[PDB]
Structure 1
Amino acid sequence: KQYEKSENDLKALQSVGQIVGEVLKQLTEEKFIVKATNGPRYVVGCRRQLDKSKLKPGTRVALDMTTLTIMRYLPREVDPLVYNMSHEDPGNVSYSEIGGLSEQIRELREVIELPLTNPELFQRVGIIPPKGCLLYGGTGKTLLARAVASQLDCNFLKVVSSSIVDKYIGESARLIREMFNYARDHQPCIIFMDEIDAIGGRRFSEGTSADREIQRTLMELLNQMDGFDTLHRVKMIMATNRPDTLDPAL
């Protein structure tokens, strides 16, 4: 058994990692113009037994070192940042554990718990449900959020609203991008921001420099939230310590 383990290692230690790649468009049945997130892009060949059709612009592929041609393709990827940002609170927080906020309970409930199951009453009226709302007020705000999170088991996503930023060029915006991507991945889904104030910010005359791409990702999220996407089964939940300071448009 041990020697078998050893030869599994042996025969395992000859494969070669393969260049992760992405395709822009295509020219022929065989010509393919793709690009890896390494940087550059090169014309590249493929395999004649691997569904040359299912390679729509947007797909995710892998490439071999040696000859740089398509060998295998893989489904979506999910940027482990948000993954470990997704499912880390098993809090036993219960409505029993809370009190003094019944009206708030129901208020929140309607806008996040009602439509996710039944849409009828609304179209019977003929009004799309809202997209995102938030509270304002130590009153059990964050705690209440953690509590309500315990009622889906599939589609709760929370973010601290500050780790989002980065030190590299700009990928912070890419982060929120992937976020809304996963949102559309499981159409029922709840994204959450904790004290979105800091990231929120407001208007400035370019005092600092990082404020620039800060506001960049800011307007990025602005667009992503309510522009050119039929907001369906996707609620945003926010809270503050001063609901004054953020952008008036937000």
Structure 2
Amino acid sequence: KTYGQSTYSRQIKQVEDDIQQLLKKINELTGIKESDTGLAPPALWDLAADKQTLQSEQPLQVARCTKIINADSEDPKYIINVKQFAKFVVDLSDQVAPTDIEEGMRVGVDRNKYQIHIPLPPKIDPTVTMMQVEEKPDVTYSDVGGCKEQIEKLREVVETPLLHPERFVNLGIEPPKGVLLFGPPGTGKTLCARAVANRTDACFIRVIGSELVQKYVGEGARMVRELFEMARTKKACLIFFDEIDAIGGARFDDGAGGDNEVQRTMLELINQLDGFDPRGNIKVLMATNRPDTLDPALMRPGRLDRKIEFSLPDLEGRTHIFKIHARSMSVERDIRFELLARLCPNSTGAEIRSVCTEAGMFAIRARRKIATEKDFLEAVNKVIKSYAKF
């Protein structure tokens, strides 16, 4: 047997095995054999055997997707383009009001008279619709230690104007609509981005620069346009371009074409950010390690108004980071996190988190259930000193 993990370990194992066996017996007795045709469990062939599939196939007809092109006269007369089928001049159904249908939107049409029955959401690239955050991270501003002024500026750029709009309209201020985050690796740029995503009560669209690079000519620009249209659809929506240096390289066209397609994608991004048309209620973050490579047009105010600089934390910030990262750890009662912060010279929150994890693993190695100050010291020696060449 083993060395003994717990007095109840054998009982837990036995009960788990019995639970698995009972589950197997119940499954065998009730049937529920897997189906290769994608059939739900018989207990959920529910209203499907009958009584709603019947009453859904009887009254609910089949509509066909089409795209309106023109509306003729005040009297309803709509030109539609059924994909790969045909084009028709069609009328509305009694259920749909004329105001619901506009030019360019997708409308379902019946198969007999081809009249519009229901408007449909706009067609959007899967690769741009998957940029939306949907589920937001659990990080908060309290988990970012050592950055007070930076976070204050970031909030007043992205958070406060959305939360308390009247405060700025009253004083006649148009708050900055873009911010750039730059600094040494591991300083907390993406962490602050996650905090902003969590706190925001609005659309958060996450875009990675490398995604906009595409094989075919004129694809990054199309993706950028679709992304900004989807953003405009919303009442207010934040876009975060991580690693923007991938596509924001400075214009250097000369002789043989070099990165011309990426430059075109950048130009489309610039045009969307600031151009003839008015940008919606869209606030834009950008995080990068090499702000130098960015182009003057993109770094101009009106596209990136604020430039927040992230630097290695001070002693107090290092102490706060140590506390934050040791919060959810099994540690002794009194550990001099101030001593640890001093003992680690200029270093990043990533280094501090690595130190905490390595202290925990030294404990796990020595077969202890409580990380000690000695463990933390050994972790500092291993991370800050031994790997000092990196």
TM bracket, shorter-chain basis: 0.7 to 0.9
Segment of structure 1 superposing worse, 4-13 or 23-32: 4-13
How far the C-alpha of 1:85 sits from its partner, in A, is 1.6
Name 1:69's counterpart in structure 2.
114
Cα RMSD over matched residues?
3.3
Consecutive unaligned residues in structure 1, runs of 5 or more: none
Q: Is this contact kept in 2: 1:61–1:73, CA < 8 A?
A: yes
Q: Where does residue 102 of structure 1 map in the other structure?
A: 148
Identity in percent: 43
Q: Deviations over 1:158-182 (max 9, x none)?
A: 1112223444563433322232223
Tell me what 1:235 maps to: 283
Aligned length: 247
1:83 aligns with 2:129: yes
Deviations 1:99-132 (A, max 9, x none): 1111101111111122112234534443311121
2:188 counterpart (128, 140, 143)? 140
One-letter amino acid of the counterpart of residue 195, structure 1: E
Tell me if structure 2 keeps the 8 A contact 1:206–1:212. Answer: no
1:111 and 1:5 mapped to 2: Cα distance? 52
Q: Does 1:5 align with 2:48?
A: yes
Alpha-carbon distance in 1 for matches of 2:282, 2:248: 20
Match of 1:246 in 2: 294
Supply the distance in 2 between the matched residues of 1:102 and 1:135 (Cα, whole angstroms): 14
User: Per chain length, whose mean CA-contact separation is higher, i.e. which structure has more relative contact order (CA < 8 Å, sep 6+)?
Assistant: 1
Deviation at 1:248, TM superposition (A): 1.3
| Counterpart Cα distance in 1 of 2:46 and 2:173 | 68
Matches within 5 A, 1:1-250: 5-7=48-50, 12=57, 16=62, 18-27=64-73, 29-35=75-81, 38=83, 42-49=87-94, 50-63=96-109, 69-77=114-122, 79=124, 80-87=126-133, 90-137=136-183, 138-168=186-216, 170-203=218-251, 204-205=253-254, 207-208=256-257, 211-231=259-279, 233-250=281-298
| Cα deviations by residue, 1:193-239 (Å, 9 ceiling, x for unpaired) | 10111121221237447x44433332222111112444464210001
Report the CA distance shift for 1:140/1:52 in structure 2 as closer, same or farther (over 3 A).
closer
Question: TM-score, normalization: structure 1?
Answer: 0.80
Post-superposition offset of 1:41: 7.4
Contact 1:136 1:243 in 2 (8 A): yes
- TM-score calculated relative to the size of structure 2: 0.54
Compare CA radii of gyration and give the structure with the larger one.
2
Unaligned runs of 5+ in 2: 1-42, 299-390
